[PDB]
Amino acid sequence: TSPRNWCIKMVCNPWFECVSMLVILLNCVTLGMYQPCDDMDCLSDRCKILQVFDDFIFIFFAMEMVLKMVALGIFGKKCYLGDTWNRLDFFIVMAGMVEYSLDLQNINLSAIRTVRVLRPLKAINRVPSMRILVNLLLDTLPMLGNVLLLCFFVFFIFGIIGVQLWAGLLRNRCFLEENFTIQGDVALPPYYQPEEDDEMPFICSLSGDNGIMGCHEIPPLKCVNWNRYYNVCRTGSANPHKGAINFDNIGYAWIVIFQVITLEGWVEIMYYVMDAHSFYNFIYFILLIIVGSFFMINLCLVVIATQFSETKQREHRLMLRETRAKLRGIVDSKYFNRGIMMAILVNTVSMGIEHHEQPEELTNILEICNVVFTSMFALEMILKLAAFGLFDYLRNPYNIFDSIIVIISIWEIVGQADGGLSVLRTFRLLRVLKLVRFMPALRRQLVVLMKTMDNVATFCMLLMLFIFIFSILGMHIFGCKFSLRTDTGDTVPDRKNFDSLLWAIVTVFQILTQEDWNVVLYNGMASTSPWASLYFVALMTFGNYVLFNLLVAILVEGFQQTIIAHKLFDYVVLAFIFLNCITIALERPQIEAGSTERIFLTVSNYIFTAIFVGEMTLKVVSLGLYFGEQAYLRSSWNVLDGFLVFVSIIDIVVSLASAGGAKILGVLRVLRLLRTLRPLRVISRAPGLKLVVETLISSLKPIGNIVLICCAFFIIFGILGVQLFKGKFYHCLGVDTRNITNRSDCMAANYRWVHHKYNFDNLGQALMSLFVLASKDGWVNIMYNGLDAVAVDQQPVTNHNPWMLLYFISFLLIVSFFVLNMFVGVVVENFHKCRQHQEAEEARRREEKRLRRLEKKRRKAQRLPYYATYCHTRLLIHSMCTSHYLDIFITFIICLNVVTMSLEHYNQPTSLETALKYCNYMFTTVFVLEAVLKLVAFGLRRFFKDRWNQLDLAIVLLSVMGITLEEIEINAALPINPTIIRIMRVLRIARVLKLLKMATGMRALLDTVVQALPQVGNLGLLFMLLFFIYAALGVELFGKLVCNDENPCEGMSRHATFENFGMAFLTLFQVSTGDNWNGIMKDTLRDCTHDERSCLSSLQFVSPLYFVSFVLTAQFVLINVVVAVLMKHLDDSNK
Ligand SMILES: COCC(=O)O[C@]1(CCN(C)CCCc2nc3ccccc3[nH]2)CCc2cc(F)ccc2[C@H]1C(C)C
Ligand SMILES: CC(C)CCC[C@@H](C)[C@H]1CC[C@H]2[C@@H]3CC=C4C[C@@H](OC(=O)CCC(=O)O)CC[C@]4(C)[C@H]3CC[C@]12C
């Protein structure tokens, strides 16, 4: 109408959207300047000006909203309520109106001020790339309901098991005597705490419940040991971690399950529950790891990638001066180019040599050499300007890079007074980047990366918006509420606080990396309410689990003589290899010389080497060493066999030469390492495993260039780290650790001049520290020591130079991007290799899938035995009792049973047990009723062929077995072990499984996993092989590393040490999960108190190689498992 047409001009004007983004950015700025640390009641100017600004902006929001309704209409598909974001904007408008009205009513209620945060979420709808990407995200969201329901499973079963096993157990500390005698001046707390403020509790084991810590393992205090008086332990006190990690209710159980899903603090609660209840709960935790934290979030990745592919194809289907010439020849020679490549390489090498405590001559050598190289660069660029011409020289901008580099270099050389030696030296490092100019394959790799990041930029902006929203929200809820209590007289703010926006964003980023996030989780749950964990759960999910998988989807779719018998000798030698593995599994360094097992170990080694050399001789005389083609060593696996048998022989020889064992100890070490490497021939002796290893190796070459690029970035950033931090990673550790600046003051206090294990003195330790930093673990501490770093030889101060945060965050983003590129490259390469197959052979099954259709034509109607049932008093049973109208009733019964098991908790009222037992009796009754209805509905045939009625009968039979049990204890008929009752109660949970009948998506997804079982099972066998090999290496390398009070352990607490072989397996498993593994390195590399040669040996040269290789190989194997599952899912999706 005409009144509508009056306002059309402005609303359709793009200037209106631009100024709306202007006011959105103003809103982001206004939300930025909030200071919950200082903004008490807004009795300051800036608070008032921000109130004025956001009042004006709210006025603008109201006017623009009302105009755009009155110019577009209301309540219609075309009207204002057409897009979701318009409805959201109306929601902001109404919420702000309500909050303003309440403010006029003089009620603060800072819970509607928790809506101020949601305002920057308005930006998506008016940014086109963002709007499209977010629309695709939302449209592919509804197809994650299946992974959400399976997540409901993995939480619910494990949570019920947890709440029924360890209900309130975690509480029990070791108390004093009930009637204790003390003369006076009672400084003894009621129970025992090793650390102050219950930092590391000492959860006992109740009498009768066989834990491990039974109050007689307490550390003897070091007169008299008062601690021995902490005798009896009961279950009344606060729970571990300031009452945040316990199995009291089901909410806390779900929090614990969430914590172990994200792989942080895992070992701590693992050891807690071991201490409390039983030694055999690592079974529960390992099954939970394997099921949830690996086969689920990776299934979430698979679902995101696949469904994003289909929804993208969907909308796709919707729209569907004579010397000048002479001097040229010297340039384009490809030989002087090689010379200047050697020059640049040696420049990078020299420029990397510099380390801490430089020899005085050496730094002069480096500066002279830098002058020489700069003169050389000046030489060839003064050459190129004339021989080619100015326009020709600028025709390639790489020459412009070179000119800029030399100009900066010469300015630095001129800068011998001040200034230049601070930053221009740091900018010298770009000369390394000159390599891309002449290494050609990287040009293709870099341009591919650029074409990919053409899509990433919008997602990167989306990440900034998302992090901003949650940082502001956390600021609103947690601002000034992390006041960590004093330790020297004043309330020290925790470094992981929310008191200011810079720390808010860096802390949200920390949380997103799943690194020491449980610390702030507890520190937030201890302040407001146990509901504050919903914030971290929401952030973790809507970050890592639905958005970063969206990134991967974006990338992948952007890419888109003597007689011989050989019957079962392989089988028998494989068995012998298994026995060899068994005997490798016992060399833990406690066997005293001359032991019976020692002798058995040695003789077994002798015999097994004899058998291996015998089969060596057999298979060579069948072939011949090198005698023509198709000889022995034409296959690498046979080559490996020969290598390992030869090194075993020389091991035996040197062992027999034990006389005069001086100066051959290093030989003994290397031979022990190699015989630990020995159990690998299974790949040769196993066809499927061999094919798998070939797939691993062949799949690595395509991402070889990406690996080289990542190594180059590691090197360059290591040189950055050396340039910035040289010897600033020193801190005076002491009881005071205050009011002192330099090492002289520290030695005056005589505390210690501690030098960190992760530091940038040379380039090598810089590379190790960068590998840890890029590993998303222990990176917070490195970042802290970076920010706090001040200068060469004095105390770091809290947040001395915050700008290093930019370096430390840029490194994570770049390395994460390169690892993501590696993953997507593996996926696409495997896809192309796969793509040939379904082109090749799947053409042959499409001949038979319609044959199966012809098979179903036989199935039309074989006079099914429905006619037998009717008129036999079961005329309605066969039909009316088999309809969906009664199956949903069973589903509702099961939901009721679920909510009943969601109620048990510690100190539940008596009426609660009575009601729960009544509900269980009702539920088992109705289960028996439906079972009988089925039994009369059909005869014996469906009882077994259904493949479900057996499960139903098992469920009802366990239920009826259970109901008989408490009847025994009501009349005290017979003493029943409480363990039996506990087992019965905890396995009543199996009744949940019947939803799989109704949840067809669960069937589909789990089956899709199942058809990939061969490849992933072979990969799992390979993964166990890798664990075994690295376990043997660890046992022989780090066997003598003792853990005690004299040797403080940060990574290996009690069973994570390298003494025996089982503990080594556990600690390799812990390393493979990226939890405190950098702590394990910090422990293993340690200059000891000269008590053993292991600390003083060359361990520093080898242990980082050990852990780096293990982390890389384990992550690669898991990545390929994920790729196999994803590819099977795509194959099924095409079908
Ligand atoms: C190493 O870089 C990350 C990457 O590539 O993700 C992995 C697993 C990582 N993820 C399970 C959680 C993401 C952790 C994370 N959030 C961040 C936000 C900002 C900055 C850094 C961040 N770090 C790496 C290796 C791997 C191994 C597997 F067995 C299965 C999947 C994967 C991928 C996968 C999810 C694509
Ligand atoms: C949709 C789900 C997945 C994420 C939704 C995020 C928020 C809407 C949720 C998650 C965390 C919840 C918060 C967790 C902690 C708190 C602090 C709590 O504050 C207090 O106890 C003190 C009250 C006062 O000071 O008067 C009030 C509930 C609240 C705001 C909760 C409100 C709703 C929040 C912000």
Ligand SMILES: CC(C)CCC[C@@H](C)[C@H]1CC[C@H]2[C@@H]3CC=C4C[C@@H](OC(=O)CCC(=O)O)CC[C@]4(C)[C@H]3CC[C@]12C
């Ligand atoms: C390539 C990325 C993915 C990881 C890099 C792994 C290695 C190339 C790095 C990580 C650990 C580094 C080592 C860590 C410790 C040292 C410090 C330094 O040893 C010393 O302490 C010298 C003084 C002495 O102990 O005698 C020599 C370099 C070296 C071996 C480093 C050499 C380079 C290493 C093996």
Ligand SMILES: CC(C)CCC[C@@H](C)[C@H]1CC[C@H]2[C@@H]3CC=C4C[C@@H](OC(=O)CCC(=O)O)CC[C@]4(C)[C@H]3CC[C@]12C
């Ligand atoms: C199937 C393989 C690839 C993975 C699973 C292997 C482990 C579950 C097995 C194999 C080797 C076994 C270990 C071999 C050595 C020991 C012997 C034993 O320690 C002793 O020698 C006794 C000490 C003494 O008597 O003084 C403790 C059990 C343990 C860790 C065994 C625990 C169970 C282990 C780790």
Ligand SMILES: *[C@@H]1O[C@H](CO)[C@@H](O)[C@H](O)[C@H]1NC(C)=O
């Ligand atoms: C540390 O320095 C401060 C500086 O004022 C001083 O007050 C204090 O006495 C010194 N000693 C200790 C133990 O704090």
Ligand SMILES: *[C@@H]1O[C@H](CO)[C@@H](O)[C@H](O)[C@H]1NC(C)=O
């Ligand atoms: C070390 O710190 C003390 C304490 O202020 C100061 O007096 C001294 O000059 C500093 N430098 C030294 C001792 O070289």
Ligand SMILES: [Ca+2]
């Ligand atoms: Ca950690």
